[PDB]
Design a binder for this molecule. Sequence first.
Ligand SMILES: NC(=O)C1=CN([C@@H]2O[C@H](COP(=O)(O)OP(=O)(O)OC[C@H]3O[C@@H](n4cnc5c(N)ncnc54)[C@H](OP(=O)(O)O)[C@@H]3O)[C@@H](O)[C@H]2O)C=CC1
Ligand SMILES: COc1ccc(Oc2cccc3nc(N)nc(N)c23)cc1
Length: 192
Amino acid sequence: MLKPNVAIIVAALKPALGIGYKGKMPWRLRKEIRYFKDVTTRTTKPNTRNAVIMGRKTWESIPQKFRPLPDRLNIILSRSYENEIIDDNIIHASSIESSLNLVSDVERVFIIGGAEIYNELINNSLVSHLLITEIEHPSPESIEMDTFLKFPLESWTKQPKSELQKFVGDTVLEDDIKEGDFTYNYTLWTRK
Ligand SMILES: NC(=O)C1=CN([C@@H]2O[C@H](COP(=O)(O)OP(=O)(O)OC[C@H]3O[C@@H](n4cnc5c(N)ncnc54)[C@H](OP(=O)(O)O)[C@@H]3O)[C@@H](O)[C@H]2O)C=CC1
Ligand SMILES: COc1ccc(Oc2cccc3nc(N)nc(N)c23)cc1
């Protein structure tokens, strides 16, 4: 695949954009996990699938029985990896671009974490869209977090809900979803 558009998908707590604590997500939002699954799996074209890219630490954090993530081509980056196809669902690479040279029949590509991957790849011009779930809490300071997005958002534009809707196709997008004390909304951002 040559120079595909790539999207980042992440869930973050406003206003600091925290995304983790001691190697895990600081919340369990059930409807948000379901959204992540639908957006990253669904395709429109026939014989295609989407690819998900993750850092080695994220891959190793999935219980072995639950990997690879089903119904998507899994790409794992490590600076120590050779560019290799493991099987039809797993690719190892040391760079995003190298990895995409190994794929065919992919419709969309999503970066799914973690923090080091996000913070480095935001500055790669292949990244064209950010799917950020903006999480809000009455007392964000009470939530322990050690990992944060370092995104240059002054260079990106938040689009209207209509644009997100068109991006995700059929997926149901509810507004101000509440689970416990958290309220969240799905957003789409593109480069200015
Ligand atoms: N809020 C959310 O939506 C999500 C949050 N997260 C959070 O992220 C945190 C984990 O992040 P982190 O520990 O940084 O792990 P990562 O998944 O980002 O893995 C980092 C590893 O990826 C490899 N790597 C990183 N950057 C590159 C690069 N530019 N090119 C090639 N290889 C690269 C390296 O592997 P090597 O060391 O082998 O070279 C590096 O050690 C957790 O707290 C998790 O909960 C994760 C996903 C989503
Ligand atoms: C440990 O394995 C993983 C950890 C996190 C992960 O990414 C997510 C998991 C669950 C919900 C998620 N929601 C959004 N908006 N973005 C992500 N990247 C998500 C995917 C795999």
